[PDB]
Amino acid sequence: ESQLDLRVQELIKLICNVQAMEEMMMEMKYNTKKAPLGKLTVAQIKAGYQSLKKIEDCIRAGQHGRALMEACNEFYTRIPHDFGLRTPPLIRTQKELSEKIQLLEALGDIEIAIKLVKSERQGLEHPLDQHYRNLHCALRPLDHESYEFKVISQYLQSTHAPTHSDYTMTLLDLFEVEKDGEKEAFREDLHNRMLLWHGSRMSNWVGILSHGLRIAPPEAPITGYMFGKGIYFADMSSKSANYCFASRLKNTGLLLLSEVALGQCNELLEANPKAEGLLQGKHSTKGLGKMAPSSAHFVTLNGSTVPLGPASDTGILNPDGYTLNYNEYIVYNPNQVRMRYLLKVQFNFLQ
Numbered sequence: 001e002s003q004l005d006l007r008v009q010e011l012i013k014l015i016c017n018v019q020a021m022e023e024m025m026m027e028m029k030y031n032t033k034k035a036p037l038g039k040l041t042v043a044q045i046k047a048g049y050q051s052l053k054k055i056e057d058c059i060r061a062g063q064h065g066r067a068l069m070e071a072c073n074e075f076y077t078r079i080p081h082d083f084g085l086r087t088p089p090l091i092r093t094q095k096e097l098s099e100k101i102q103l104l105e106a107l108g109d110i111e112i113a114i115k116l117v118k119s120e121r122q123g124l125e126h127p128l129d130q131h132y133r134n135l136h137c138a139l140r141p142l143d144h145e146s147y148e149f150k151v152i153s154q155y156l157q158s159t160h161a162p163t164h165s166d167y168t169m170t171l172l173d174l175f176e177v178e179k180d181g182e183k184e185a186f187r188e189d190l191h192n193r194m195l196l197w198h199g200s201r202m203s204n205w206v207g208i209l210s211h212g213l214r215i216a217p218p219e220a221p222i223t224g225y226m227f228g229k230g231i232y233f234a235d236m237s238s239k240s241a242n243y244c245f246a247s248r249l250k251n252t253g254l255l256l257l258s259e260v261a262l263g264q265c266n267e268l269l270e271a272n273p274k275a276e277g278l279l280q281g282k283h284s285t286k287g288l289g290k291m292a293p294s295s296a297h298f299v300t301l302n303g304s305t306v307p308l309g310p311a312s313d314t315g316i317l318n319p320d321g322y323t324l325n326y327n328e329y330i331v332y333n334p335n336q337v338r339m340r341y342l343l344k345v346q347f348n349f350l351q
């Protein structure tokens, strides 16, 4: 009938596509036929998180053996995987837990997406306008010659990590973001307000937009989060772009630039999942990397420090294989976040 800007319809179309959701889950080896995503419940997702913590309990307590296999057997029962020919493998490292956490994470935002897309069937509203309404989050496109588009494009290209050399990033569209209740709840008076990157999977963008960026649930095992249950940001565009998991086939992603009020940072050299306890007054955790932009080449876009620049070495040591190659910012309270811009990104793979 009558809708909205053609670039926003293309955004709503991309993120409300459940067919692509049904595929991303099979690439994570989730049996979508045994448990259709339509009949997804927060109770089953909670139950899977609990079983992951059970699995963690056996790992951290050295109780391998059967107690581990009994927990994986429970998790694999309530969260149906599809490896086809072989027995589903055990989960014996934090990498496997942190991978199952993403499955559950994505499986959570798919519940939110299907719930939202299954909402009002109003005859006086084109379907892409109902979804946009149920999002409760403004998405207004910016001119390609606008002040914001120019600095954000430089932010993307100037902070593409040298070690992420398999793709190039091309800004297809820039939307201004405003989630209802985010400005009014923001710690707008805290210092070190920075425009940082965050990237996630496609299925999660109805979640992050309608519900904001969120603290991990209580039922999740804390060993899957290298710095605690917080909202993770990067100052390197490609570091967040990697987390979009853009495919050679599906080479489109969404990057989010948010205002992050960090305040005083509790800078850590090596990951520590109990990092929130080490705050003790400080307002954020800064994962120190060996390569990052420099304070000289920074600018300020509409109130916030934009960490521009080519980026170089930081002098950061702790001789150990977990020396972050690039910096990592964590906040443990959604009030320190204000979603501000959204980028439609085209990944041009080079291999």
Ligand SMILES: CCC(CC)N1CCN(C(=O)c2cc(Cn3c(=O)[nH]c(=O)c4ccccc43)ccc2F)CC1=O
Pocket: 105, 109, 197, 198, 199, 200, 204, 207, 208, 212, 213, 214, 215, 216, 217, 225, 226, 228, 229, 230, 231, 232, 233, 234, 239, 240, 241, 243, 328, 329
């Ligand atoms: C519970 C709801 C779901 C909804 C999707 N969720 C997930 C948790 N979460 C995070 O921020 C989070 C992200 C990562 C990985 N990581 C990423 O993915 N993108 C990035 O740019 C990024 C940049 C630097 C470092 C890590 C990054 C790890 C742990 C986290 F806690 C907020 C949230 O709301």
